Assembly symmetry: C2
Homo-oligomer: 350 residues x 2
C-alpha cells in the first residue's frame, strides 16, 4: 500500500537559502531512487514536507528525517495509508522557499500559513502527545471505537501542597509545581508510560497492563530525583521541601471518542477520583512514599524487594486488598503530621 | 490603537464562486468606509480572513461577521493589539478563491493549508475553549503570569458508575457517559461557567467567585434535565438509571503557565482530588443530589430555599463546615445502597 505523511518542523539552527536548496536537490535524488515523491517548503525557520510512496520506504526515510540534526520539534500532522494515487507524481522532491517568494497572491497565504502554524504550536502544548501518536499512526482520534483495556494507573501528589500556597507568593508556588510536574512527566515518559492529566497537584498516568515493572521503576526514579532535587537546591529554596506520595493500581480504562462534543478525550477511568483519593490517604497514613496494590505487585516480573504494609480498599467495593511497597533505603522513612509541620516551619522562614 | 484579527470558519451551506466574490466586493465597500483592510480566502468550504483597523471598528465588524448565517464554527486564531502598521494597506478587502486558483506553486500550498486546518480542527476538540478565549483577547496563553483567584468549583459524578461498566457492553458505557458529559457541559456553559476537565466520570468546572447563584442554578438545571432524560428514554435504555451527584465549594485556584513543558494548562486547584472525593462522599451519604458548602451558600445573593444538612470537612483542614442543599421536590429523595441495587437490577435486565 502507498503511504503519505505530512509534517512540520523547526530549524534547529539558521539555514541559508542555498543550504535549503541543496537539501531539496539531494532529497530529490534519493527519493527518485526510492520511487518516493513530495514537496518541501520553508517559511521563516519552519519546514513543511509532504512525502508519498510505498509505506516501507516512506518509514525508512522518515526515520532518517527524524534523526536529521538540522531541524527539531518534528510533528506529523497527517498520516494516510492505502493511498490510491500520488499528489505529486512528477516531484521526487520539489522545493519551495517561501521566504524568497514575492508573488502577489502568495504573500497573504504566507501570513496565514505562519499564523496557522504558530497557533498549532500553541495548541500542541495544551493537548496530550497521545493524540498525536494516534495521528501519526494514520487514524483520526475522533474515529477510535470503544475498547476496554487494563492499565497500570499511576497517581502521585505533592505532600502538604496547601502549605506552599499558604506560605509562598503565587509565582513561587507555580515554580514548585512546574518543577514537580516536569520531573514526573520526563521519567514516566522515559519509562514508557503516558501522563493523561493533572488533577490539581496530582499527576495521573497510565502504563500498559503488563508494564508494572516499568511503573515501579518510574516511581522509584521519581523519588530518587526528588531527593536529589531537595538536596541540591539553593539555600532557602522551596524545592527543599518538595516531597511526593505515589500510588499504583490496576484499572479498567475505556478508550474511545469520549466527551461533550464541545470537549473530547480518548480515555476514561471510572472513579479515578476515588482511587486517587484512597492512594493519597495511604501514602499519608503509612509514611511510605510509594504504595501499590496486590494486582500491581503480582503483575510485576522482576525480583523487587516487596514488603507487605497493610490492607486497604481502593475501588469502593468491599474487597480488602493487600497494599505493598518496596523496602529500600529511600522508602525507610519515619513519619505523618511531622512532615506537614516540617514543611510549614521551613517555608515560613524563606 | 490598531487591531488585527485572523479567523477561520466553515461554510454552513454550499456557496458558489460568484456568491463568494460578492461577499468580498461588498466587504471591500464596507471596509473602505470604515478604513479597515484585509484579505478573504476560501478553500473547499473553509473561509480564512484577516481584518485590520481601528480596534473599535474591528470589533463592530467582527460582531457582525460572527452573526452571519453563511458560515459556522468561527475560530479566531490570532488577535493582535497595538499594531504598528497594516499588512494589507491597499486592500479594503481582497478576495482570493483558492478553489479556482490553478497556479503551479499554489497547488501544494493549498494541500498544506487544508491539512493544517483539518488538523487544527481536531486539536480544537481536545483543548479547553478557555485557551481560545485567552487567544481571542489578544494574549498568548503561554504568557499568562501567575494569579490567585477565588472560584466556585463544581464537581459532579455518575451514581454507581462502576455498575454500568460491569453490566453493559463498552460501547454503551461510552454512550451513557457522553450523554452525561453533554448535559453537564451545555448547562454549565449556558450559566457562564467553564468545564476544566473530566476526572473519570467526574465533571470539574469553575464559576467566577461571585457567581454562586449561577453555579446553583446550573446544578438544579442539570438535575432537572437528567430527570427528563431518564423519564423520556426508550424502554430498556441505560439512560433510565443515569443519576448524578453534584457538589459545590469555593477554591483558591492559581492561573498561570502551569505544567511540564511537555504538557501545559492555564489553571491549578490544589487538592482538587480530595475536594471531589469528599463531595462525592456527601452526596452518597446524604441521599441528596446537590450539596454545597457554607461559603457557597453565603456567597449566593438570590433567595434560594436553602436547607442545612450536616457538617463535613472538605479541605483536609480540621475546620468543620456547614453543608447545605436546596429543599425542593427534586432534592426530596429517599436513599444510599438502595440506589446502587436499583441501577444494577435494571441494567442486568437490558
Ligand atoms: C526538512 C528536511 C527534509 C528532508 N527530506 C528528505 C527526503 O524527502 N528524502 C530523503 O531521502 N532525505 C530527506 N532529508 C534528509 C535526511 O534527514 C538525511 O540527511 C538523508 O536522508 C540521509 O541520507 P543517507 O541515506 O545517506 O543516510 C530531509 C532533511 C530535512 C532537514
Ligand atoms: C466570510 C465572511 C467575511 C466577511 N467579511 C466582512 C468584512 O470584512 N467586512 C464587512 O463589513 N462585512 C463582512 N462580512 C459580512 C457581514 O457578516 C455582514 O453580512 C455585513 O457586514 C452586514 O452589513 P450591514 O452593515 O448592512 O449590517 C463577511 C461575511 C462573511 C461570511
Ligand atoms: Ca495533594
Ligand atoms: Ca490482606
Ligand atoms: Ca463516580
Ligand atoms: Ca456546623
Amino acid at each position: 500500500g502507498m503511504k503519505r505523511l505530512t509534517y512540520i518542523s523547526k530549524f534547529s539552527r539558521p539555514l541559508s537559502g542555498d543550504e535549503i536548496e541543496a537539501i531539496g536537490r539531494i532529497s530529490s535524488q534519493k527519493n527518485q531512487q526510492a520511487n518516493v515523491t513530495g514537496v518541501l517548503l520553508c517559511l521563516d525557520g519552519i519546514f513543511f514536507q509532504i512525502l508519498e510512496g510505498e509505506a516501507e520506504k516512506i518509514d525508512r526515510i522518515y526515520e532518517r528525517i527524524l534523526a536529521d540534526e538540522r531541524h527539531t520539534d518534528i510533528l506529523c500532522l497527517k498520516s494516510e495509508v492505502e493511498v490510491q494515487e500520488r499528489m505529486f507524481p512528477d516531484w521526487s522532491m520539489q522545493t519551495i522557499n517561501l521566504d524568497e517568494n514575492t508573488d502577489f497572491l502568495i504573500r497573504p497565504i504566507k501570513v496565514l500559513l505562519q499564523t496557522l502554524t504558530e497557533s498549532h504550536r500553541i495548541l500542541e502544548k495544551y493537548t496530550q502527545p497521545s493524540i498525536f501518536k494516534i495521528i501519526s499512526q494514520g487514524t483520526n482520534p475522533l474515529n477510535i471505537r470503544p475498547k476496554a483495556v487494563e492499565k497500570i494507573v499511576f497517581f502521585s501528589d505533592i505532600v502538604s501542597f496547601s502549605t506552599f500556597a499558604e506560605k509562598l507568593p503565587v509565582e513561587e508556588v507555580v515554580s514548585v509545581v512546574n518543577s514537580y510536574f516536569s520531573v514526573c512527566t520526563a521519567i514516566i515518559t522515559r519509562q514508557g508510560g503516558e501522563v493523561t492529566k493533572f488533577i490539581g497537584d496530582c499527576v495521573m498516568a497510565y502504563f500498559d497492563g503488563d508494564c508494572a515493572d516499568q511503573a515501579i521503576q518510574a516511581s522509584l526514579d521519581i523519588l530518587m530525583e526528588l531527593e536529589i532535587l531537595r538536596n541540591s537546591a539553593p539555600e532557602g529554596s522551596p524545592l527543599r521541601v518538595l516531597y511526593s506520595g505515589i500510588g499504583l493500581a490496576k484499572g479498567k480504562v475505556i478508550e474511545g471518542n469520549i466527551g461533550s462534543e464541545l470537549k473530547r478525550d480518548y480515555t476514561i477511568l471510572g472513579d479515578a477520583v476515588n482511587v486517587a483519593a484512597r492512594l493519597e490517604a495511604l501514602t499519608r497514613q503509612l509514611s511510605q512514599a510509594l504504595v501499590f496494590s496486590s494486582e500491581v505487585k503480582n503483575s510485576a516480573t522482576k525480583s523487587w524487594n516487596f514488603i507487605w504494609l497493610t490492607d486497604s480498599e481502593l475501588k469502593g467495593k468491599s474487597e480488602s486488598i493487600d497494599i505493598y511497597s518496596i523496602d529500600n533505603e529511600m522508602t525507610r522513612k519515619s513519619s505523618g503530621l511531622e512532615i506537614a509541620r516540617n514543611i510549614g516551619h521551613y517555608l515560613e522562614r524563606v
